[PDB]
Design a protein around this ligand. Structure first.
Ligand SMILES: c1ccc(Oc2ccc(-c3cnc[nH]3)cc2)cc1
Ligand SMILES: [Yb+3]
Ligand SMILES: [Yb+3]
Ligand SMILES: [Zn+2]
Length: 607
């Protein structure tokens, strides 16, 4: 039972294939076309079925060349409206039919962001991008919008000829549009069965540069060169991931660097990972996001969560693999450093939500909950902590990686629950069941708050961050002169970020301390988005008025939710910037990504 979907479940019927034929209309801000769904009946005498839709305009439904009856139910908030389709003939079990739905998206589709030329790098062309995870595919096309159903797809997308279209699929050619010479049709093929949240589309003035044997980086021309350098470790990370998870089955691994309003750090769209331009630090320091997206090619894209209640399966295992890739490239001491950092991020999420909050549970119950509202570090970090705890309990990383590879092999091309995962863990580790029976499963999986046990972490790389953070926290006015730029000479950008995170956990600090920190460290000059984000939060929470224009600029010049949401919340909580935070949000609301706009609105209590 997928409580986030209004469609017929996989026990009734299953979509096997989607053939999408659409046109991108920038003037109307609509995608117009036909979604031809190959549906297989799982029941005898099947006469109707239900699909998910959200703000879609349906023109007609054609089956076997004839128009059929359909009805749209009442809208159920963020779940959208169920579409019931009357089949022209009753279907036997395993019988297939093609249902061709003519539709148009709304300009306010929650899956899409339409950008005017002014909102892009080049300033001459418009731009469009999609983001389906978790339940926004229904706001693009009618579908069984549930990760419990996997389908292949083909697509033909008509766009203005001066633009390029890309999808989460293999590029299958381009031709002039035979119905409009001012347009081009780009073709796509996704031969590997995927859940529909993995369907993705981008249309804009895109250029590409090859960075590996199976990787192109795509972006507007202005970002191509910086992107090619930033993500140069991609091929080496793909090779390590294959060693850990088995063959890469997707063919190509391309990267698309989106405009700054992209709401997430990355999105694992198959064949075409989408990334935030906030990774463009100039030193490859934020490349763990690429390692994370690459890992999803196994954990999430091959083995998928059956419902959103089991999303931790996707994230926990991906973070676990991501940390091993970075560990193979930079050492085991670095893997422990990132892991311990992740525990800190989990402490933060638990503190923010509250230790009894249901969203702090590993397995959640999303009935009547908008998944976008539940989104946090919890499934990532509590999921990772569980796996890291199990690794230590079970004999170490080599042993636990053996389980991960077998797990991916066992469940490839399937959608699974937490019970399916636990059963296989027990089956794989049959000779260690007595060890497994010591795990407090009810607490780990179903209880809110911090996990019952904290794993063991090597402290080598963390020690200098903790030492410097503690020097600042315990410093009195007569100690401020003892700080100097030399305090940072032996710290990597990762350690600098960790020093800020540690200090931020004890914020506010006195205003004189924060002013001294700028004087000696010149943190205002740092472009690295992670570091700048934590430094600006530290300044605002410490009531430094000078930081207000810097924090407002970062919150609005980019839209990665991880940065924009806490920056707006900190600015709203500071009396000196409260009014400016609310006004800036209201002024930018129309230009923002629809999900980000909704979430920042809720955070600020501005309707
Ligand atoms: C993007 C948007 C929403 C989404 O849905 C969620 C979010 C959080 C959980 C969750 C699990 N434990 C605690 N929170 C589960 C599902 C996933 C991706
Ligand atoms: Yb081809
Ligand atoms: Yb003193
Ligand atoms: Zn992920």
């Amino acid at each position: 039972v997928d409580t986030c979907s209004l469609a017929s479940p996989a026990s009734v019927c299953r979509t096997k294939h989607l053939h999408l034929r659409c046109s991108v209309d920038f003037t109307r801000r609509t995608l117009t076309g036909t979604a031809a769904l190959t549906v297989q009946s799982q029941e005898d005498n099947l006469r109707s079925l239900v699909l998910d839709t959200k703000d879609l305009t349906i023109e007609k439904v054609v089956i076997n060349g004839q128009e059929v009856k359909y009805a749209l139910g009442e809208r159920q908030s963020y779940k959208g409206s169920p579409m019931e389709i009357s089949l022209p003939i009753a279907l036997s079990k395993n019988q297939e039919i093609v249902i061709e739905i003519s539709f148009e998206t709304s300009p306010k589709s929650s899956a899409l962001q339409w950008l005017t030329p002014e909102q892009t790098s080049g300033k001459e062309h418009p731009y469009l991008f999609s983001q389906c995870q978790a339940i926004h595919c229904r706001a693009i096309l009618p579908c069984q919008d549930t990760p419990s159903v996997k389908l292949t797809y083909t697509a033909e997308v008509s766009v203005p000829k001066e633009l390029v279209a890309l999808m989460s699929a293999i590029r299958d050619g381009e031709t002039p549009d035979p119905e409009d010479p001012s347009r081009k049709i780009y073709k796509f093929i996704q031969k590997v069965p995927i859940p529909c949240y993995l369907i993705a589309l981008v249309v804009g003035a895109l250029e590409s540069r090859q960075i590996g044997p199976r990787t192109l980086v795509w972006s507007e021309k202005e970002q191509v060169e910086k992107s090619a350098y930033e993500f140069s470790e991609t091929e080496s990370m793909l090779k390590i991931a294959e060693d850990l998870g088995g063959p890469y089955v997707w063919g190509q691994y391309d990267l698309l660097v989106l405009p700054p309003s992209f709401p997430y750090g990355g999105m694992e769209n198959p064949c075409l990972t989408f990334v935030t331009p906030t990774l463009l630090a100039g030193d490859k320091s934020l490349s763990n996001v690429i390692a994370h997206e690459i890992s999803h090619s196994w954990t999430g894209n091959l083995v998928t969560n059956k419902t959103w209640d089991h999303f931790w399966l996707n994230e926990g295992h991906t973070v676990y693999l991501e940390r091993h890739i970075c560990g193979r490239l930079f050492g085991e001491k670095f893997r422990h450093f990132n892991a311990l950092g992740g525990w800190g991020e989990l402490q933060n999420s638990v503190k923010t939500f509250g230790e009894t909050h249901p969203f702090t549970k590993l397995v959640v119950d999303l009935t009547d909950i908008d998944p976008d509202v539940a989104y946090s570090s919890v499934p990532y970090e509590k999921g990772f902590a569980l796996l890291f705890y199990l690794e230590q309990l079970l004999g170490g990383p080599e042993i636990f990686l053996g389980f991960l590879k077998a797990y991916v092999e066992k469940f490839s091309y399937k959608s699974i629950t937490t019970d399916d995962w636990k059963d296989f863990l027990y089956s794989y580790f049959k000779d260690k069941v007595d060890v497994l029976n010591q795990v407090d499963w009810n607490a780990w999986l179903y209880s809110p708050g911090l996990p019952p046990i904290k794993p063991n972490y090597d402290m080598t790389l963390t020690n200098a961050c903790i030492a410097l953070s503690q020097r600042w926290i315990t410093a009195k006015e007569d100690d401020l002169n003892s700080f100097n730029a030399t305090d940072l000479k032996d710290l990597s950008s990762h350690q600098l970020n960790e020093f800020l995170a540690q200090t931020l956990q004890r914020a506010p600090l006195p205003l004189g301390h924060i002013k001294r920190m700028q004087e000696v460290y010149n943190f205002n000059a740092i472009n690295n988005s992670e570091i700048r984000f934590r430094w600006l939060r530290l300044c605002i929470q410490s009531k430094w008025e000078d930081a207000i224009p810097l924090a407002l600029k970062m919150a609005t010049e980019q839209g990665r939710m991880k940065f924009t949401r806490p920056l707006f919340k900190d600015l709203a909580a500071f009396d000196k910037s409260h009014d400016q935070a609310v006004r800036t949000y209201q002024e930018h609301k129309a230009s923002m990504h629809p999900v980000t706009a909704m979430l920042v609105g809720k955070d600020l209590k501005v309707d």
